[PDB]
């Protein structure tokens, strides 16, 4: 299928004392593989998947140097932004950045992105052409004009189209045993008497990867939305995901209802029915 490499960066200013807290994490698809935390003792980029551990010392050195450079850029930006928004030095503020690349099922470049937020709202983003920027407000507009004049996008474009893809492909192959494996949902149904006249059926999808999944209930072969509940997809902690969906039904009518499960790991969708 398609794949992506994405890096996420957060920097939170600390007005009482010291420098901004900075946290960076890197993902391939739904798998975290590296982290940096400015408050950790190591002051190094750290592995978070086994397959990255085979990278040699020059890798770790270079990623550490780069991530620390990123932390400084975010520090400077927090200053610039407090000035653009005419904010006092007293409050804590946040910058967030995400960049990366997607490839298609042929592992060739599909799209690149580079987005920035301030205090949890869009600030500036690279357009899909990778040559110009979209600014959300008049402060970001000043950034857009500066970056366009300076051709900030051209080295970034070359990274997103070239370097990013080359690394993503390297990781996919070195991480093959997990990154190229789908884990189909392990499914089951539970039944819970609510009263003498109504029951809850809960359809479970467990231990799947990647996280994208669809669970739908049908009654006599038509989609049912009322009297249902769905939870957000949640991490199990072991790199896989969980979800459930439930429906409330008249006792004795359980067999009318089917739960339908769609996932990349399933060549055909699964249908579950309470007929135990």
């Amino acid at each position: 299928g398609s794949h992506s490499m994405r890096y996420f960066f957060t920097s939170v200013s600390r007005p009482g004392r010291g420098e901004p807290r900075f946290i960076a994490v890197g993902y391939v698809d739904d798998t975290q593989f590296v982290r940096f935390d400015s408050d950790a003792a190591s002051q190094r980029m750290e592995p978070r998947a086994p397959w990255i551990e085979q990278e040699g010392p020059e890798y770790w050195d270079g990623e550490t140097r780069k991530v620390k450079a990123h932390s400084q850029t975010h520090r400077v930006d927090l200053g610039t932004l407090r000035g653009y928004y005419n904010q006092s030095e007293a409050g804590s503020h946040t910058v967030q950045r995400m960049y990366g690349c997607d490839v298609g099922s042929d592992w060739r470049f599909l799209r690149g992105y580079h987005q920035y937020a301030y205090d949890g709202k869009d600030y500036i983003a690279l357009k899909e052409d990778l040559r110009s920027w979209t600014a959300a407000d008049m402060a970001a507009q000043t950034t857009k004009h500066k970056w366009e004049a300076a051709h900030v996008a051209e080295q970034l474009r070359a990274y997103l189209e070239g370097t990013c893809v080359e690394w993503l492909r390297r990781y996919l192959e070195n991480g093959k045993e997990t990154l190229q494996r789908t884990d189909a949902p392990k499914t089951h149904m539970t039944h819970h008497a609510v009263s003498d006249h109504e029951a809850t059926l809960r359809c479970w999808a467990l231990s799947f990867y990647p996280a994208e999944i669809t669970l739908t209930w049908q009654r006599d072969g038509e989609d049912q939305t009322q009297d249902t509940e769905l939870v957000e997809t949640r991490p199990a902690g072991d790199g896989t995901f969980q979800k459930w969906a439930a429906v409330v039904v008249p006792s004795g009518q359980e067999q009318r209802y089917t739960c339908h499960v769609q996932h990349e790991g399933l060549p055909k969708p699964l249908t579950l029915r309470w007929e135990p």
């Binding site: 991530v67 990013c164 690394w167």
Partner: peptide, 9 residues
Amino acid sequence: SLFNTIAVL
């Protein structure tokens, strides 16, 4: 692998 040089605002 990270991008080598993110520019400031």
